[PDB]
Amino acid sequence: RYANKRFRKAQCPIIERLTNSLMMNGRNNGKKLKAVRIIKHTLDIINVLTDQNPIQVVVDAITNTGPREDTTRVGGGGAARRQAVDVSPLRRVNQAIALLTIGAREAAFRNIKTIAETLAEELINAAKGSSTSYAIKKKDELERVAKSNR
Amino acid sequence: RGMTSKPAGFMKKLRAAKLAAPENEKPAPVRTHMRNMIIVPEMIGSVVGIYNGKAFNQVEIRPEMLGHYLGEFSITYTPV
Amino acid sequence: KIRITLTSTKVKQLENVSSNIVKNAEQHNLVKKGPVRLPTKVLKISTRKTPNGEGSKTWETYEMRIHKRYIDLEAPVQIVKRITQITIEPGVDVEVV
Amino acid sequence: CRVCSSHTGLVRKYDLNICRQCFREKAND
Amino acid sequence: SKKRKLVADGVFYAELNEFFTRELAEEGYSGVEVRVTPTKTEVIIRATRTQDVLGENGRRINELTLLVQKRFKYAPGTIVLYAERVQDRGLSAVAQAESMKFKLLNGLAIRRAAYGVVRYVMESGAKGCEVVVSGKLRAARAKAMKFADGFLIHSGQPVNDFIDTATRHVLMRQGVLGIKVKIMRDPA
Amino acid sequence: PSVQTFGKKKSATAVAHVKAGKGLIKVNGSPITLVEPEILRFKVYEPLLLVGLDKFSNIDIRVRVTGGGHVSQVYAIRQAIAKGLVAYHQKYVDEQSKNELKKAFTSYDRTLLIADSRRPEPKKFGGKGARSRFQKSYR
RNA sequence: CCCCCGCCGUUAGUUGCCAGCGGUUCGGCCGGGCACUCUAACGGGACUGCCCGCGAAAGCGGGAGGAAGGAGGGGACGACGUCUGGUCAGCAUGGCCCUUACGGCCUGGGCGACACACGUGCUACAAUGCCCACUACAAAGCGAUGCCACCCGGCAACGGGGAGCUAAUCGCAAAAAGGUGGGCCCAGUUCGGAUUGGGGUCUGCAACCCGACCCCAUGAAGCCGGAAUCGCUAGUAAUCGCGGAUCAGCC
């Protein structure tokens, strides 16, 4: 596709690769620093509001957000039917992370000088401890679309 | 708006305008590309046509008008 | 304190040239500083190929690395004699303080 | 410039060449 | 040279070359190297017929060299005038080109003139050679002519070809026709 | 004794001087944290931690850094500490530089040992950025 | 095969730094020292060479080391030809045409007009933000009437005075994004700066037509854009500031 999967250096605070990916999703204009800060501050936000350790909260969020099945269009003899299909494990992560950041940006709450609260709140809302929020919606909606046209 | 201590005015029209001064004035116009020039009193009463770039517009210059540029009198852009 | 600047396109043309000057002056002055290298700077110039004239439209990119060599000679005397007639290689442009 | 007299754009230093063109031309051979 | 008069110093060289090409044509100009220090420039014109340049007992070399001084005053500084013979004019692309350019002026069959030149060049030394004629062949519709022998291949590719190149023009009643001569020699 | 390592990245040079000690870092006089304040990025002393029992609590570093930017410096210093660590002992510096800190078949683990050759990049013509190409429109 | 950029080493040290010591008008200024950066010349390094997997082979995938890879990144090298491609307005040149003028000088105007249409862009609609303050990292360039240190008068543009530089040794220069602290509190707003009124600086003979800059007031549309459509595969896109050519000044 775009290119071969490049391996990402694990996170400085918690040496989790998945985290860095998330951070990359947040960052824009290569402002890697602001991006890391927002995620870290959110993690701190996750600590206070929620007793649980942030790393666990985030991972659980991504799980709720990953779509198992997605619908892809295809041209049949008549009309382009939307064929439902599985999603690559690689694909699911990129979608989940992307959707979180997008929904997070979606939130009204403008907290912290930046975005940092929206990420914090979004992740918790995602958790399935709380499996709500805009991110999960998209995920649920896609799956629903699939198997509709089973 | 003060450009500098000495008001600039290109010599093409100045030298030309002033010569007209001793005879009197010059009937008919003058025509100069030098919209850049500021107008001085000797200019007054005269009718200098300025260059739109398209054409030269007759501009009678009166006293209230002196400090100005002359170009200010000939508009480059037309709604047409 | 005669500072000598030797510049050239070819690294060898200087090594030869500047080296000669070292040996000669050894005869009538102090003992030279020894050919000091002075790093080579490369210049990239993007310009009109010709000077104002034909083909202003033209361009082109050039890179010309130029080499330097000082070898200073303090306490001068009949250094000048041994130096003046003695030079060799073209391809070298030497200027002295 | 000096040689060709193309005014359009001669480098001062050479102050020669038709312009860049002759500069490049002379340089070329 | 000097920042101030590198250009000035340069203009003179063109000035010198200007006269030499005009005069020395019969001699067979190949190249005019110009080396310089202060008021003493080298200028060593290379020629096929050194005789034509020198003159008898060196009479012409005197006039030309003197002419040079008029153009090169003390400020330009007196200049010398060395002349070296071109070993085998047949090797000089410039000459080979000029050679063909002349015949064309005569109105010789261009294609043949080309063959001959490649042959001469090919004939004495030269690992490879190629000649190109512009258009308006025989005052005809513009065309192009070729001809080549030996490996110009392994040349053209920049890697140390040592291919002499030369172009010669040809004014004609019909029009100008450029000539290109490529000669391949042992590479580096 | 002291150990040395240079380290340059983008355009930056960092002199890294390791000395057995507390583990503090004096960069350009300020404390490592001081020169670096609020930079999540500053994982210059990553090569130290990688040694095993993190070298730090058994090392000390005086560093001079000039040229480029704080990010570039972070990389240069990171390389410095990576290289010096090797000189002190071949063993410690492992796979990126020597053994585990040292080298790999293909992908770079950290590959602290290498000097990132990446430089800004000249702007090619016909393109705005160098790489970035202008987009097309229906026009 | 050649050039520029990536890593390492030798040679060379008036570039460089207490790296390391003594002094200081504590400016690397002084002695001293080539280590380092660097300067420029040469040498090393990458070849699917090594390890696992498939293959008949070429090679494809993966992994280690490594600054770097499987053409590491950018040039020179844009083939024979195509488009009756583009330019007689850069210059050159055949033919045709004008010669009190289809030439030449000048002043002024025009190339800057507008009911409208399109292309390329800038700024923006904001809180991952705007403003004020404090504080930190860059590269490549340019400088003789030219860059302008520092001091003074001015809110300021800028003016007066004046040191050094002839430019790795002085100046442009402040780097901006960034980090720290404060303000704003979701509003067409401490968003956004169009537009317009006034005052004024500067270049230049001269800024009406028709310059840029400063300060006060004004404070528009714009709350993320229909159909349709463009760029870019990594230090790339995105984002931030810095220099240059042209050049009195400057759109």
JSON list of N, CA and C in Angstrom, two decimals, chain D:
[
{"chain": "D", "resi": 1, "resn": "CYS", "atom": "N", "xyz": [25.49, 40.88, -23.26]},
{"chain": "D", "resi": 1, "resn": "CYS", "atom": "CA", "xyz": [26.21, 41.90, -22.49]},
{"chain": "D", "resi": 1, "resn": "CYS", "atom": "C", "xyz": [27.36, 42.41, -23.29]},
{"chain": "D", "resi": 2, "resn": "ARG", "atom": "N", "xyz": [28.58, 42.21, -22.76]},
{"chain": "D", "resi": 2, "resn": "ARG", "atom": "CA", "xyz": [29.69, 42.76, -23.46]},
{"chain": "D", "resi": 2, "resn": "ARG", "atom": "C", "xyz": [29.83, 42.09, -24.79]},
{"chain": "D", "resi": 3, "resn": "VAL", "atom": "N", "xyz": [29.81, 40.74, -24.85]},
{"chain": "D", "resi": 3, "resn": "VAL", "atom": "CA", "xyz": [29.97, 40.15, -26.16]},
{"chain": "D", "resi": 3, "resn": "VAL", "atom": "C", "xyz": [28.76, 40.28, -27.04]},
{"chain": "D", "resi": 4, "resn": "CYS", "atom": "N", "xyz": [27.66, 39.58, -26.67]},
{"chain": "D", "resi": 4, "resn": "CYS", "atom": "CA", "xyz": [26.45, 39.46, -27.43]},
{"chain": "D", "resi": 4, "resn": "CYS", "atom": "C", "xyz": [25.61, 40.69, -27.31]},
{"chain": "D", "resi": 5, "resn": "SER", "atom": "N", "xyz": [25.71, 41.37, -26.16]},
{"chain": "D", "resi": 5, "resn": "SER", "atom": "CA", "xyz": [24.92, 42.53, -25.85]},
{"chain": "D", "resi": 5, "resn": "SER", "atom": "C", "xyz": [23.52, 42.14, -25.53]},
{"chain": "D", "resi": 6, "resn": "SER", "atom": "N", "xyz": [23.27, 40.86, -25.17]},
{"chain": "D", "resi": 6, "resn": "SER", "atom": "CA", "xyz": [21.93, 40.68, -24.72]},
{"chain": "D", "resi": 6, "resn": "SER", "atom": "C", "xyz": [21.87, 41.28, -23.35]},
{"chain": "D", "resi": 7, "resn": "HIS", "atom": "N", "xyz": [21.06, 42.35, -23.24]},
{"chain": "D", "resi": 7, "resn": "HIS", "atom": "CA", "xyz": [20.87, 43.13, -22.05]},
{"chain": "D", "resi": 7, "resn": "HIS", "atom": "C", "xyz": [20.14, 42.35, -21.01]},
{"chain": "D", "resi": 8, "resn": "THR", "atom": "N", "xyz": [19.29, 41.39, -21.41]},
{"chain": "D", "resi": 8, "resn": "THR", "atom": "CA", "xyz": [18.31, 40.81, -20.53]},
{"chain": "D", "resi": 8, "resn": "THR", "atom": "C", "xyz": [18.88, 40.24, -19.26]},
{"chain": "D", "resi": 9, "resn": "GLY", "atom": "N", "xyz": [20.14, 39.78, -19.21]},
{"chain": "D", "resi": 9, "resn": "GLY", "atom": "CA", "xyz": [20.54, 39.32, -17.91]},
{"chain": "D", "resi": 9, "resn": "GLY", "atom": "C", "xyz": [21.90, 38.72, -17.98]},
{"chain": "D", "resi": 10, "resn": "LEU", "atom": "N", "xyz": [22.87, 39.62, -17.74]},
{"chain": "D", "resi": 10, "resn": "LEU", "atom": "CA", "xyz": [24.25, 39.28, -17.80]},
{"chain": "D", "resi": 10, "resn": "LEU", "atom": "C", "xyz": [24.74, 39.41, -16.41]},
{"chain": "D", "resi": 11, "resn": "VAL", "atom": "N", "xyz": [25.58, 38.47, -15.97]},
{"chain": "D", "resi": 11, "resn": "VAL", "atom": "CA", "xyz": [26.10, 38.65, -14.65]},
{"chain": "D", "resi": 11, "resn": "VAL", "atom": "C", "xyz": [27.09, 39.77, -14.73]},
{"chain": "D", "resi": 12, "resn": "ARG", "atom": "N", "xyz": [27.21, 40.57, -13.64]},
{"chain": "D", "resi": 12, "resn": "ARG", "atom": "CA", "xyz": [28.09, 41.71, -13.62]},
{"chain": "D", "resi": 12, "resn": "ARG", "atom": "C", "xyz": [29.51, 41.25, -13.68]},
{"chain": "D", "resi": 13, "resn": "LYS", "atom": "N", "xyz": [29.83, 40.19, -12.92]},
{"chain": "D", "resi": 13, "resn": "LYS", "atom": "CA", "xyz": [31.18, 39.77, -12.77]},
{"chain": "D", "resi": 13, "resn": "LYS", "atom": "C", "xyz": [31.77, 39.50, -14.11]},
{"chain": "D", "resi": 14, "resn": "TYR", "atom": "N", "xyz": [31.11, 38.62, -14.89]},
{"chain": "D", "resi": 14, "resn": "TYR", "atom": "CA", "xyz": [31.62, 38.38, -16.21]},
{"chain": "D", "resi": 14, "resn": "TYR", "atom": "C", "xyz": [31.36, 39.61, -17.01]},
{"chain": "D", "resi": 15, "resn": "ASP", "atom": "N", "xyz": [30.16, 40.18, -16.82]},
{"chain": "D", "resi": 15, "resn": "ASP", "atom": "CA", "xyz": [29.67, 41.34, -17.53]},
{"chain": "D", "resi": 15, "resn": "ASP", "atom": "C", "xyz": [29.79, 41.00, -18.97]},
{"chain": "D", "resi": 16, "resn": "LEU", "atom": "N", "xyz": [29.66, 39.69, -19.25]},
{"chain": "D", "resi": 16, "resn": "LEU", "atom": "CA", "xyz": [29.83, 39.19, -20.57]},
{"chain": "D", "resi": 16, "resn": "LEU", "atom": "C", "xyz": [28.74, 38.25, -20.87]},
{"chain": "D", "resi": 17, "resn": "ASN", "atom": "N", "xyz": [28.87, 37.68, -22.08]},
{"chain": "D", "resi": 17, "resn": "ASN", "atom": "CA", "xyz": [28.03, 36.64, -22.54]},
{"chain": "D", "resi": 17, "resn": "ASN", "atom": "C", "xyz": [26.82, 37.29, -23.06]},
{"chain": "D", "resi": 18, "resn": "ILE", "atom": "N", "xyz": [26.06, 36.54, -23.87]},
{"chain": "D", "resi": 18, "resn": "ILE", "atom": "CA", "xyz": [24.84, 37.04, -24.38]},
{"chain": "D", "resi": 18, "resn": "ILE", "atom": "C", "xyz": [24.06, 37.32, -23.15]},
{"chain": "D", "resi": 19, "resn": "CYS", "atom": "N", "xyz": [24.16, 36.39, -22.19]},
{"chain": "D", "resi": 19, "resn": "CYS", "atom": "CA", "xyz": [23.52, 36.43, -20.92]},
{"chain": "D", "resi": 19, "resn": "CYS", "atom": "C", "xyz": [24.07, 35.24, -20.24]},
{"chain": "D", "resi": 20, "resn": "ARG", "atom": "N", "xyz": [23.18, 34.52, -19.56]},
{"chain": "D", "resi": 20, "resn": "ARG", "atom": "CA", "xyz": [23.63, 33.30, -18.99]},
{"chain": "D", "resi": 20, "resn": "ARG", "atom": "C", "xyz": [23.99, 32.43, -20.16]},
{"chain": "D", "resi": 21, "resn": "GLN", "atom": "N", "xyz": [23.29, 32.60, -21.30]},
{"chain": "D", "resi": 21, "resn": "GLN", "atom": "CA", "xyz": [23.51, 31.68, -22.39]},
{"chain": "D", "resi": 21, "resn": "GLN", "atom": "C", "xyz": [24.94, 31.66, -22.83]},
{"chain": "D", "resi": 22, "resn": "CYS", "atom": "N", "xyz": [25.54, 32.82, -23.18]},
{"chain": "D", "resi": 22, "resn": "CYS", "atom": "CA", "xyz": [26.89, 32.79, -23.67]},
{"chain": "D", "resi": 22, "resn": "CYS", "atom": "C", "xyz": [27.81, 32.38, -22.57]},
{"chain": "D", "resi": 23, "resn": "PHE", "atom": "N", "xyz": [27.47, 32.76, -21.33]},
{"chain": "D", "resi": 23, "resn": "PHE", "atom": "CA", "xyz": [28.28, 32.40, -20.21]},
{"chain": "D", "resi": 23, "resn": "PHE", "atom": "C", "xyz": [28.40, 30.91, -20.23]},
{"chain": "D", "resi": 24, "resn": "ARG", "atom": "N", "xyz": [27.26, 30.22, -20.39]},
{"chain": "D", "resi": 24, "resn": "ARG", "atom": "CA", "xyz": [27.21, 28.79, -20.44]},
{"chain": "D", "resi": 24, "resn": "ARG", "atom": "C", "xyz": [27.87, 28.31, -21.70]},
{"chain": "D", "resi": 25, "resn": "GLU", "atom": "N", "xyz": [27.71, 29.06, -22.81]},
{"chain": "D", "resi": 25, "resn": "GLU", "atom": "CA", "xyz": [28.24, 28.63, -24.08]},
{"chain": "D", "resi": 25, "resn": "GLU", "atom": "C", "xyz": [29.73, 28.56, -24.03]},
{"chain": "D", "resi": 26, "resn": "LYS", "atom": "N", "xyz": [30.37, 29.64, -23.53]},
{"chain": "D", "resi": 26, "resn": "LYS", "atom": "CA", "xyz": [31.80, 29.70, -23.52]},
{"chain": "D", "resi": 26, "resn": "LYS", "atom": "C", "xyz": [32.28, 28.65, -22.58]},
{"chain": "D", "resi": 27, "resn": "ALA", "atom": "N", "xyz": [31.55, 28.50, -21.47]},
{"chain": "D", "resi": 27, "resn": "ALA", "atom": "CA", "xyz": [31.88, 27.55, -20.45]},
{"chain": "D", "resi": 27, "resn": "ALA", "atom": "C", "xyz": [31.79, 26.19, -21.05]},
{"chain": "D", "resi": 28, "resn": "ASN", "atom": "N", "xyz": [30.82, 25.98, -21.96]},
{"chain": "D", "resi": 28, "resn": "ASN", "atom": "CA", "xyz": [30.60, 24.67, -22.48]},
{"chain": "D", "resi": 28, "resn": "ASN", "atom": "C", "xyz": [31.79, 24.15, -23.20]},
{"chain": "D", "resi": 29, "resn": "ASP", "atom": "N", "xyz": [32.46, 24.96, -24.05]},
{"chain": "D", "resi": 29, "resn": "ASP", "atom": "CA", "xyz": [33.56, 24.32, -24.70]},
{"chain": "D", "resi": 29, "resn": "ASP", "atom": "C", "xyz": [34.78, 24.43, -23.77]}
]
